[model samples]
Target: GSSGSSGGLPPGWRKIHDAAGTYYWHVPSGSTQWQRPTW
Candidate 1:
């Protein structure tokens, strides 16, 4: 596993990546789930 900072992401939002190179964000509240970055 890898670790990272959210950078400019909104409050409560987190940036994360797996060892396999998959990247995404997790919403700890509200919907409570992980979602891929919108591009």
Candidate 2:
């Protein structure tokens, strides 16, 4: 398993990885909208 940063991600945001090994920013369940950076 990969290690995740502690309190690293901002509120209302998270990272998701696709099958193609690509990373993306998304709003988690029950979360509010927040700013995200474009990769």
Candidate 3:
């Protein structure tokens, strides 16, 4: 999914690339500590 900000990377999620395709990231909201999802 490319375009504006609408990213949410949860369990078994994938990364998204920017319009430029020069960068990619995911946005997951949850605890502050840390926890590993699926992948």
Candidate 4:
């Protein structure tokens, strides 16, 4: 369950890693936010 920005970390965004090594933006939960890049 990793949640980073599309092309990497976004502006003013911070990444958070869980104890299980899961990377995410904001906090890991059912409401985690993420955006897919428009290639």
Candidate 3 per-residue lDDT, tens place, 1-39, comes to: 347545554553344445745322334543322222332
lDDT for model 4: 0.41
**Per-residue lDDT of 1-39 in model 1, one digit per residue for the tens?**
137554344566555567766545546543323544421
Candidate with top lDDT is 1
Instruction: Choose 2 or 4, whichever is better by TM-score.
Output: 2
What's each prediction's TM-score? 0.31, 0.30, 0.18, 0.26
Question: What are the per-residue Cα lDDT tens digits for candidate 2 across 1-39?
Answer: 137433345455565555755453546444423343322
Residue 2: error of model 1 in Å?
Answer: 26
lDDT of 4 by residue, 1-39 (tens): 157444544344445566765434432232344442221
Q: lDDT of all predictions, in order shown?
A: 0.48, 0.45, 0.39, 0.41
Which candidate leads in TM-score?
1
TM-score-best of 3 and 4: 4
Candidate scoring better on lDDT of 2 and 3: 2
The lDDT of model 3 is 0.39
Global fold similarity of model 3 (TM-score)? 0.18
Where model 1 places Cα greater than 4 Å from the true spot, the runs are 1-7, 28-39
